[PDB]
Amino acid sequence: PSQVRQNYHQDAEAAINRQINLELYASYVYLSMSCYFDRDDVALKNFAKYFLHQSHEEREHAEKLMKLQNQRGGRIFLQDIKKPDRDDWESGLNAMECALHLEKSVNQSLLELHKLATDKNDPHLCDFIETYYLSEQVKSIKELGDHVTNLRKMGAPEAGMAEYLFDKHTLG
Amino acid sequence: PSQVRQNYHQDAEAAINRQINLELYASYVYLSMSCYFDRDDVALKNFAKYFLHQSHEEREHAEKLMKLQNQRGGRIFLQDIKKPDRDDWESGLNAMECALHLEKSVNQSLLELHKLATDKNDPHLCDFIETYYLSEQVKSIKELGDHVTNLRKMGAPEAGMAEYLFDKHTLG
Amino acid sequence: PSQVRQNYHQDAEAAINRQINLELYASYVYLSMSCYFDRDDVALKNFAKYFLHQSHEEREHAEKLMKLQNQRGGRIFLQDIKKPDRDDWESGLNAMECALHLEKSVNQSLLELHKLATDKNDPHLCDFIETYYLSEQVKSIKELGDHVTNLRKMGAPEAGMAEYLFDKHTLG
Amino acid sequence: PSQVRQNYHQDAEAAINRQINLELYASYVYLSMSCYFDRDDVALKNFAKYFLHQSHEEREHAEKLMKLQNQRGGRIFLQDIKKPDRDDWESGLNAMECALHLEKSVNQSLLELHKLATDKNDPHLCDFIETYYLSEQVKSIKELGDHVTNLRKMGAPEAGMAEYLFDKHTLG
Ligand SMILES: [Fe+3]
Ligand SMILES: [Zn+2]
Ligand SMILES: [Zn+2]
Ligand SMILES: [Zn+2]
Ligand SMILES: [Zn+2]
């Protein structure tokens, strides 16, 4: 094995590779969303900016897991990054709902990774996930839930000014 | 011919004179729009500011074509600047739709000028159009399309707050 | 069609979507390379930094094509991002040779896109490619060729100090 | 018991005392290494500086465990600090290999301490180890593995310039 490897289970290595792919997939979904709001028939620049930022953040998350894998003496194996489930995201409200679902899915994967690390008595990996991933996900989920709540109350998407004014006030 | 003239077709010279007139016409249309929004019964100051800026930009475009004509040793021949098609522009949404149409018309003229320059093997003129006109037009068209989309979604012109709030948030 | 669309062929739209995928693929290849040099048994930090920068640049290139597609009124359709051809890049010299090949492949695709835009009399798209893609690619190819030349002369990969000293002096 | 003591097992107290001794031992090993590279017949000043820094860091680690022991109401019991296994460390490469082994040994001890804290349901102690010790050790191990890899590739110790140039470029 690698000269640095210590207390690092093959299962954990495999699970980290899976998580890298999921974070890269999430980045790609956000990029798709960002583009949608940049269309001339949608034209919500602050929704576009918000989702592009999220795309860049999920990239960074993937890169930090790659750094971990090498720090522990595992080996990164990349897989195809699947295309997002859709090209047309329908509305600001629908995109925020889809983002909430995605973030909860990523959180579920991270909780399964923590359970594996706990089972394999790998405290460094448990601490890493907690320190850099789990509080970030809880914060993200709460922010997206707040956005969904506000858009729904305002009357989106049927009330035409709702997404416009949300774009200006909350996302601007 | 002029002592500076080289590789500059009489057709191209004539087409540049036509384009000068079209840019001056566009400036005048924008000025008309700007004034409309300054009326006491319309009273949308940021629409007025937006169209006055566009008027000044289209002037500048005309003046840059005049500079080109003299740089290449052509001769500027000015024509009457026709009055705009209307005095009353109806609404913020209607003015933005009319502006989009105008910008697409100007773009079409520039594409015809580029085709002529290409046919006449005039790379300096092709590059000039591309460098200073074609990307400017694509950007303008996309911005106006985004504005039209937003105003329509917000409910303009029948929803009375739509143009008011668009004036404040997007154009302010 | 889109309200902004003018002089934008369906073929060109499709070719831009293909190019977006190729740039995203290139970004992923560079990311794979970057990771490789971060392994404890490779341990060349400036090679890793160099390829991570290239990964981020190719992302940016993809995002600029997405912006173009929306500016012209085309519609972005994303596809799967295929995994790179390998996980183990063998040596600094081999990775630079593979990067040179990749950059030439991307250049070839851009030259085919320019030929299509020329055929379809789309000067804005021709100018865009030239302005933001073709000189960038020529510069990249020349830089990678210079790196390959230097590493080969120095004796890489068999001369053990060659990649070490190149990492320090050229990439540091 | 101490007036502050709460949820702090006698086993944990004993294990912390053991860890204090191990960190003091590691500091002493590093000091020995540092001195070696300061000899007139070895004369690698940046190797000497690197190991002296590591010596001072391992002191600090010991002192932080002493602070913990008193914060939790345990009592520090010091033991002899054994001399390092050798006086002559042979080469820069051999010292880095010996340091890697030592760091892995210290990590193993910390993982055993975390397992004990987990068994004894002592979350404050688990968190302390994770927060200040486990990520520090993973980082140290990866850095030493990278150094060993580079020195081996460069041809150390038989290639006479390898340690000289590594001292200048990596450690300088
Ligand atoms: Fe040197
Ligand atoms: Zn994430
Ligand atoms: Zn103009
Ligand atoms: Zn590129
Ligand atoms: Zn220590």
Author numbering:
A (entry chain K), B (entry chain O), C (entry chain A), D (entry chain B): 5 to 176
The publication says:
The Apollo (Direct Electron LP, San Diego, CA USA) is a new high-performance direct detector that addresses these challenges by using a novel event-based MAPS detector custom designed for ultra-fast electron counting. We characterized the physical performance of the camera by measuring the noise power spectrum (NPS), modulation transfer function (MTF), and detective quantum efficiency (DQE). These results were extended by testing the performance of the camera for single particle cryo-EM by collecting data on two common test samples, the 481 kDa apoferritin and 149 kDa aldolase. Finally high-resolution apoferritin and aldolase datasets were collected and reconstructed to 1.66 Å and 2.24 Å respectively. Our results demonstrate that the Apollo camera performs well across a broad range of dose rates and is capable of capturing high quality data that produce high-resolution reconstructions for large and small single particle samples.
Thus, another dataset was collected with an ice-optimized apoferritin grid. 3804 images were collected on this grid at a dose rate of 15 detected eps. This resulted in 286,970 particles after classification that reconstructed to 1.66 Å resolution. The expected indications of high resolution were present in the reconstruction including holes in 6 and 5 membered rings, the observation of numerous water molecules and ions and the beginnings of indications of hydrogens. There is a presumed Zn2+ atom chelated between Glu23, Glu58, and His61. The ice-optimized map had clear evidence of the Zn2+ atom, similar to other high resolution cryo-EM apoferritin reconstructions, whereas it was absent in the earlier 15 detected eps map. In addition to the differences in the Zn2+ density, there were differences in the water molecules surrounding the Zn2+ and the density for chelating residues Glu23, Glu58, and His61 became more well defined indicating that they are better stabilized in the presence of the ion. In the presence of the ion, residues Glu23, Glu58, and His61 are stabilized and two waters fill out two of the three the remaining ligand positions leaving one remaining. There are no other observable changes in the peptide backbone. These data indicate that there is a network of interactions between the Zn2+ ion, surrounding waters, and side chains that rearrange based on the presence and absence of the ion.
